[PDB]
Amino acid sequence: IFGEQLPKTSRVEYIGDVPIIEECPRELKTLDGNPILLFGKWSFEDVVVRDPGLRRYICLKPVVLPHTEGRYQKRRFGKAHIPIVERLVNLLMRPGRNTGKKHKAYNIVKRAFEIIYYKTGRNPIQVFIDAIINTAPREEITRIIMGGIAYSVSVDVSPQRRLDLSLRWITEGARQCSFNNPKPIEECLADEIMAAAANDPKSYAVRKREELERIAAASR
Amino acid sequence: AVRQLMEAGAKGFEIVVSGKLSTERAKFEKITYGKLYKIGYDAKNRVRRAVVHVLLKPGIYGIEVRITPATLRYSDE
Amino acid sequence: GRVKPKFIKSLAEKLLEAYPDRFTESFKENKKAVAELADIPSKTVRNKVAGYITRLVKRQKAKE
Amino acid sequence: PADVAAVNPFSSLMSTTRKINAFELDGVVVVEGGNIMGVVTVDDLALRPVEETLRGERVVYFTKSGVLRKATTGLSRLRYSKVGTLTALDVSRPVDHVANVNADVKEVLDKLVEQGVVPVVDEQGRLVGVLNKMDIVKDLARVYVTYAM
RNA sequence: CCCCGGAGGACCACCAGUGGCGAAAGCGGGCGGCCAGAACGCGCCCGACGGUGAGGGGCGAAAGCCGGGGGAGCAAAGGGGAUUAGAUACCCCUGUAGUCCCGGCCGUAAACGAUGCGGGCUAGCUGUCGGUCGGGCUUAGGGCCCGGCCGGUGGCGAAGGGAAACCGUUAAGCCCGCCGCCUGGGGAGUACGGCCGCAAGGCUGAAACUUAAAGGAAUUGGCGGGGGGGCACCACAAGGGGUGAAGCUUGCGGCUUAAUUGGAAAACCUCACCCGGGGGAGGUGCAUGGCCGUCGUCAGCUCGUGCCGUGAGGUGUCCGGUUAAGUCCGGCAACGAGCGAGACCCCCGCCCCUAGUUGCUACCCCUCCCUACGGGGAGGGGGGCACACUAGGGGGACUGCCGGCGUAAGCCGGAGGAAGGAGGGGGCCACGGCAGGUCAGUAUGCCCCGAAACCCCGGGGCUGCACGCGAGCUGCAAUGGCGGGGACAGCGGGAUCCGACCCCGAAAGGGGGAGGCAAUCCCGUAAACCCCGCCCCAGUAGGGAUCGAGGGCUGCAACUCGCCCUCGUGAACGUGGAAUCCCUAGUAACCGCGUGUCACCAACG
Ligand SMILES: [Mg+2]
Ligand SMILES: [Mg+2]
Ligand SMILES: [Mg+2]
Ligand SMILES: [Mg+2]
Ligand SMILES: [Mg+2]
Ligand SMILES: [Mg+2]
Ligand SMILES: [Mg+2]
Ligand SMILES: [Mg+2]
Ligand SMILES: [Mg+2]
Ligand SMILES: [Mg+2]
Ligand SMILES: [Mg+2]
Ligand SMILES: [Mg+2]
Ligand SMILES: [Mg+2]
Ligand SMILES: [Mg+2]
Ligand SMILES: [Mg+2]
Ligand SMILES: [Mg+2]
Ligand SMILES: [Mg+2]
Ligand SMILES: [Mg+2]
Ligand SMILES: [Mg+2]
Ligand SMILES: [Mg+2]
Ligand SMILES: [Mg+2]
Ligand SMILES: [Mg+2]
Ligand SMILES: [Mg+2]
Ligand SMILES: [Mg+2]
Ligand SMILES: [Mg+2]
Ligand SMILES: [Mg+2]
Ligand SMILES: [Mg+2]
Ligand SMILES: [Mg+2]
Ligand SMILES: [Mg+2]
Ligand SMILES: [Mg+2]
Ligand SMILES: [Mg+2]
């Protein structure tokens, strides 16, 4: 439902009546016609995003290393073009002593994607995609005032906000697991993504989305 | 000393004599004119300003003058 | 450009009616004539006056 | 018991302080409409800067529309006339831990020391009682009163 | 709570109104009886019988008083539950007079239109009530509409009046009568007296004394726990990083002191303070100038002529849309204009021209080395300005094109485009203020010290330390510590200064010293980062305070009181309460480097 046109690089996949929209082109091969591999190892082609609203904002455009310069934050909804794996790398640069160390976070995700594949025998890009679908909240709570005491009220979360919340909980879930104990960060991140992909309550991300949706049901 | 500048066709002037002009509390008298820019390029670089102070009986009584001749065409047409 | 102040608007309106037959509905030609038909020691003001005077021709030609 | 150690969120600071001291408690629960809005204890209050609010330096007052102002003096206006200090919801901290009456008291002894005070709820989840560190001290005195005198 | 019945007292919802009646108080269900007063219609009667009215009389809300009856709801006083610092209040539960009826008393009220009563004259337009007349219709009605007269009741508004608000045929206008009242504020509706009353109390009502204003209306502002709109990371929302807790550096307060100096890059000098000796860095930044900070991440401030107003003052500058903008567009008693905004000025980003003692290396040849044998690589020179680089001028972007909306200012999406909505970062600081900061930057009035202020000297102090507050550094660890290895910048500075390179030394550092007065020589192969190896959750191979022994540098001088290195010693600290700060993209955060201050030293800019 639109009368305001649409930028190029977009694509409509009209199904029944619904206009499903993808902002990133899945179709990119080399000039010879070979597929492009994330980290030179994993293939974007078999990857499916099961969620309709999240199909628009997860950028599965095939890239070798997920390194955009940070040139997509200027415009509203410019985060749709940042590749989804680079969003994971961009959330590993915390706390303040790790800000700007993208090579470090690149190695963490790369080594994590190797652990994911061997421990699971599945596509490392695919399992991370299913982590987000099993993590991203569908309802939230807001502030409201009634004359002195701020109550809550449930609302819907837009499809861009769900991706920002699933990703933040995954990375912050793994980062707290690695603090002040011998477990390495890549092992923490790999286990967190594998757990949340399997919908296990032990993961930080599944707990966070359960608490937020549980709270919203009380405060409809 | 205002019609003296009326002898010239100056499009702007601004005289500020600041001090204890009549009492023990300084008062800052000031008389201005029309097309006289105050900030940006003309002011502080291409508009004449010369501040002098004169020791009267108590005495500092600083005088600030900003003038512009009849041909000081600034960038506006 | 957000809003054109008066010295864009007053300058552009006068230049149109002095030479009503020397301004077309294209910005490129209008930029040339304004630089020759007006004292314009500022690149931005020339373009702003030329862009606006492109727009009177549209409304005037839209009027008829 | 619920009535003797609960408060309303708009109870003044001096009121809840005197209610704490007079009844020999470690804290009280701030409830409004059976909703556990938080707790206020003596340990957290001790390090709080309460001299400002009991000095006219921090006042709260309702408008003739309903809104709660919570202004600060000295930054513009110094006289405020008929104003309060700070309600029990403001010096309170948000509750974290709740105990059920059907449980053993041992399960919350660890939680009780960190929280200072723990509310108690029935099957309906409503507030029923509050468990303080002084209640077990009364429990310990009961044994010696039973035995050695 | 629901149903079937009974009793009781008060009230008369909607209709219903700037509607009606009445002298005022006051009067709201229906039917009836007895009265009263008006309006209209009238060729009815009398014939000036009228107006006002001191003194005199009568009526007169609510509360209250006297005696009787009644008592539903409400509710002074009181009882209780809360709230609160207090709460003999505001809220809640309850509650007695009272509220209601009858007979009497009281005689007051913001008893108000704050406007005495009677009469005449003086544009109008409009709503509505009563009567009547004319015309047109009929719910064939006592009905409705149009118009005229008379009488009421509202609104706007001539002339006129007024200090103005405003009144204006319902006068506060122009007149004719009569009664009442006023003569600055407070003292004071108080005292004395008298009369009235059951009482409460009421009416009538001063003075001494004290005082220079009290007071009306209106204007500008300020302010509001009044209303509306706009805006901002020195606001919030969504976020990221923090501070607040530890050790340490540092500023202020307090404490101590002979002194800890005075205001809101420290050993000397600085220096202004203390101890000893040989013209004002003394006050008043409420006497000033100049300069500066903030209002002001504002959009405001004015003028010409006109218009309103006796005037202070309004208008324009208001309203609606728009935005960064008091920027514009459209309406208006306004039409234009000026400063501020912008434009303007620096730097960044893309293209073109000019140019190549310096900078760049595609293209060559000589060497050296390696060579899987083809070639590769490094050095020297030539040639060239091609690339890049430097520096001046110019071009480019304008909401320009497309779609939508909008009268239109313009807004939203899109395309192209190096660059897109003011392209990005900054300068310039409008009127007028903040009795803001600065007489310790210079200058300066006034007042003080006066062979005493002196940037004189020696020594000390500014470095003293239970504690409070502010800004920071490095940490608490594993996204880490340590050790080896590989790199990659950009400013900026350099004259007796930068210092290549050589030697000495374990480090700090020491000796010699090319080149460079600057795209030439030097600082200068930055750190974070990447790679490899050890560490493995512990107050530790984290942390590096504190302390002991020793070695050096600057300087006239290093103890109080400087900086660097070695060996050893290994404190708190395991992520920090209430609270609180900053930030919208090459930004936050992290990392180093240059430099200011500087004999030496930066946890600071
Ligand atoms: Mg640890
Ligand atoms: Mg400007
Ligand atoms: Mg009388
Ligand atoms: Mg009564
Ligand atoms: Mg009651
Ligand atoms: Mg009763
Ligand atoms: Mg009266
Ligand atoms: Mg009068
Ligand atoms: Mg009138
Ligand atoms: Mg009287
Ligand atoms: Mg008397
Ligand atoms: Mg006002
Ligand atoms: Mg926030
Ligand atoms: Mg600290
Ligand atoms: Mg107007
Ligand atoms: Mg000395
Ligand atoms: Mg000091
Ligand atoms: Mg000392
Ligand atoms: Mg470290
Ligand atoms: Mg820190
Ligand atoms: Mg380099
Ligand atoms: Mg070198
Ligand atoms: Mg260096
Ligand atoms: Mg240790
Ligand atoms: Mg260590
Ligand atoms: Mg020693
Ligand atoms: Mg020393
Ligand atoms: Mg050591
Ligand atoms: Mg500890
Ligand atoms: Mg912290
Ligand atoms: Mg230097």
Curated annotation (Swiss-Prot), chain B:
<comment type="function">
    <text>Binds the lower part of the 30S subunit head.</text>
</comment>
<comment type="similarity">
    <text>Belongs to the universal ribosomal protein uS3 family.</text>
</comment>
<protein>
    <recommendedName>
        <fullName>Small ribosomal subunit protein uS3</fullName>
    </recommendedName>
</protein>
<comment type="subunit">
    <text>Part of the 30S ribosomal subunit.</text>
</comment>
From Swiss-Prot, chain C:
<protein>
    <recommendedName>
        <fullName>Small ribosomal subunit protein eS17</fullName>
    </recommendedName>
</protein>
<dbReference type="GO" id="GO:0003735">
    <property type="term" value="F:structural constituent of ribosome"/>
</dbReference>
<dbReference type="GO" id="GO:1990904">
    <property type="term" value="C:ribonucleoprotein complex"/>
</dbReference>
<keyword id="KW-0687">Ribonucleoprotein</keyword>
<dbReference type="InterPro" id="IPR001210">
    <property type="entry name" value="Ribosomal_eS17"/>
</dbReference>
<dbReference type="GO" id="GO:0006412">
    <property type="term" value="P:translation"/>
</dbReference>
<dbReference type="InterPro" id="IPR036401">
    <property type="entry name" value="Ribosomal_eS17_sf"/>
</dbReference>
<comment type="similarity">
    <text>Belongs to the eukaryotic ribosomal protein eS17 family.</text>
</comment>
<dbReference type="InterPro" id="IPR018273">
    <property type="entry name" value="Ribosomal_eS17_CS"/>
</dbReference>
<dbReference type="GO" id="GO:0005840">
    <property type="term" value="C:ribosome"/>
</dbReference>
<keyword id="KW-0689">Ribosomal protein</keyword>
<dbReference type="GO" id="GO:0005829">
    <property type="term" value="C:cytosol"/>
</dbReference>
<dbReference type="Pfam" id="PF00833">
    <property type="entry name" value="Ribosomal_S17e"/>
</dbReference>
